[PDB]
């Protein structure tokens, strides 16, 4: 029910896009 | 009490071979600066294993409203851990400032849900810019073009303890 | 959401296979080895040939 909701999903991505890369190299 | 909004930054204490940790920052609604820092370390335990003695505040600042005159339409996430396990709640408040909105919410939550000030997490308060993104009914109520409505049954507060007129609502 | 939700779930669910089967191997790999400690090792490795049969 929340309007600005789809923005939050990519913000989950962009932190985890780093976290797959940062823990290795 | 009439709250304030606080940017609070902490950095838990640099040790030997660990200088400069990553400067964590939250937006805290509270009355004064003392409660905010008290509220601050509280979240920092739930998020991960830092504790109050282990670290320090970098800095604290009060956030004014960028437009304290413009009527805004606010979307609010609240989750709270009652009566069994928690659950989110999304209510919409048409209001003036950020700190104005949270006040009525704490008035609202203490009205219905017997919700303590400790009981409540304010996850995120978002301004809805565009109309027809506002989803609740009663907030949509006040948005129609050229809104007019009466006041019915206008009482008048008497000052002294007597009157001579059989006073009537005015009208 | 649901696509992103299940791969967040299936990596958990794939570990329930992989991590528990790592243990249930090593739990039995200590079982006969604990049984090998008392009885003579010619008999136990004989019995290891019995278990690999079926």
């Amino acid at each position: 029910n929340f309007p600005y909701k789809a923005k939050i999903l990519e913000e989950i991505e962009a932190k985890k896009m780093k976290d797959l890369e940062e823990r290795e190299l | 009490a009439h709250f304030k909004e606080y940017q609070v930054i902490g950095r838990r204490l640099p040790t030997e071979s660990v200088p400069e940790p990553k400067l964590f920052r939250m937006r805290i609604f509270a009355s004064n600066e003392v409660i905010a820092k008290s509220r601050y370390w509280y979240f920092l335990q739930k998020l991960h294993k830092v504790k109050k003695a282990s670290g320090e505040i970098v800095s604290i600042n009060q956030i004014n409203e960028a437009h304290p005159t413009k009527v805004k339409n606010f979307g609010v996430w609240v989750r709270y851990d009652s009566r069994s396990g928690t659950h989110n709640m999304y209510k919409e408040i048409r209001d003036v400032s950020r700190v104005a909105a949270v006040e009525t919410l704490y008035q609202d939550m203490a009205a219905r849900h017997r919700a303590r000030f400790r009981s409540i997490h304010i996850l995120k308060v978002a301004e809805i810019e565009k109309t027809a993104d506002v989803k609740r009914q009663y907030v949509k109520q006040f948005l129609t073009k050229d809104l007019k409505f009466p006041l019915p049954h206008r009482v008048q507060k008497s000052t002294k303890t007597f009157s001579y007129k059989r006073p009537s609502t005015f009208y | 959401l649901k696509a992103l939700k299940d791969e967040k779930e299936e990596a958990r669910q794939a570990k329930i296979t992989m991590l528990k089967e790592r243990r249930e191997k090593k739990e039995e790999n200590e079982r006969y080895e604990r049984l090998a400690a008392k009885m003579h090792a010619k008999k136990v490795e004989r019995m290891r040939r019995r278990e690999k049969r079926n």
């Binding site: - | 009663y138 109520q141 006040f142 409505f149 009466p150 019915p152 | -």
Partner: protein, 191 residues
């Protein structure tokens, strides 16, 4: 959920007029006149033009809103009460004792009289309410015809007449007798 303002619309045909001070309504048209008090209900009326009237409730809840809808229905019934009128047709089935039914004028009070209900000796009388007419149906047997402008002054006066011939302390499956509402209608016929 605190509705700010609601409205209904009362549609008014040509031959009738209404006259509304504070919450008192007079309805005038062809077949007669009708009045009704509404001081207990807290509404607000507004003529737009001569055939339509908006009613209103400002800043109310459900119980207040649910009162608003039923006001609309009442006024309509008064409107039809002067145009088309109301007609209740009733029949009085007896098995063995022929139920004598008459109108008497007991000191100007116009009593409908039931004699010989079910072989009784007690003679029952229902006072005709004001402004409802009662006639005995010619040319179709055993029927009685009630008619007036009000809904309620007919229907209650209809219902009182069939509550008065209730069969007491018997099995109701074997004994059928009584007066029954046969048919609900209009005094026009056709429209």
């Amino acid at each position: 959920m605190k509705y700010i303002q609601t409205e209904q619309q009362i549609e008014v045909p040509e031959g009738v007029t209404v006259s509304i001070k504070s919450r008192i309504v007079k309805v005038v048209g062809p077949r007669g006149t009708l009045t009704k008090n509404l001081k207990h209900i807290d509404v607000t009326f507004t003529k737009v033009n001569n055939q339509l009237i908006k009613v209103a409730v400002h800043n109310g809840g459900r119980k207040h809103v649910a009162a608003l809808r039923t006001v609309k229905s009442l006024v309509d019934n008064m409107i039809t009460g002067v145009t088309k009128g109301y007609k209740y047709k009733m029949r009085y089935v007896y098995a063995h004792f022929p139920i004598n039914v008459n109108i008497v004028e007991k000191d100007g009070a116009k009593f409908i009289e039931v004699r010989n209900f079910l072989g009784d000796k007690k003679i029952r009388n229902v006072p005709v309410r004001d402004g409802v007419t009662i006639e005995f149906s010619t040319n179709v047997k055993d029927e009685i015809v009630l008619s007036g402008n009000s809904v309620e002054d007919v229907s209650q006066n209809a219902a009182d007449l069939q509550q008065i011939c209730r069969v007491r302390n018997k099995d109701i499956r074997k004994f059928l007798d009584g007066i029954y509402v046969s048919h609900k209608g209009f005094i026009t016929e056709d429209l």
